[PDB]
């Protein structure tokens, strides 16, 4: 296999926004390790002239999720949202950064 181009580690929320604001297409995203919740992950996505942030939650069994559907890994959560919108307000499909 090859590594994933979307894991940025501990990049500040502000820097994620600065980086994603420069992206060409809506849906461009990255997964970052939260600085507010040690051990927690956040999903940053470009949409128009904004950058939306989604908190990656974990249920009682340790599965990850954003809304209702649960995933056994960040990898599956990410791939799922390439075909299903991450947003409740508009259609936003995840696309790898350029």
């Amino acid at each position: 296999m090859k590594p994933h181009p979307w894991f940025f580690g501990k990049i500040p929320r502000a820097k994620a926004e600065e980086m994603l604001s420069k992206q060409r297409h809506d849906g461009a995203f990255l997964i970052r390790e939260s600085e507010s919740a040690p051990g927690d992950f956040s999903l940053s996505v470009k949409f128009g002239n904004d950058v939306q942030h989604f908190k990656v939650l974990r249920d009682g069994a340790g599965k990850y999720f954003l809304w209702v559907v649960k995933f056994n890994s960040l990898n599956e959560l990410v791939d799922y949202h390439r075909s299903t919108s991450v947003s409740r307000n508009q259609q936003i499909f995840l696309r790898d950064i350029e």
Partner: peptide, 7 residues
Amino acid sequence: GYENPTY
């Protein structure tokens, strides 16, 4: 904050 309610 985040787009998805966190609690």
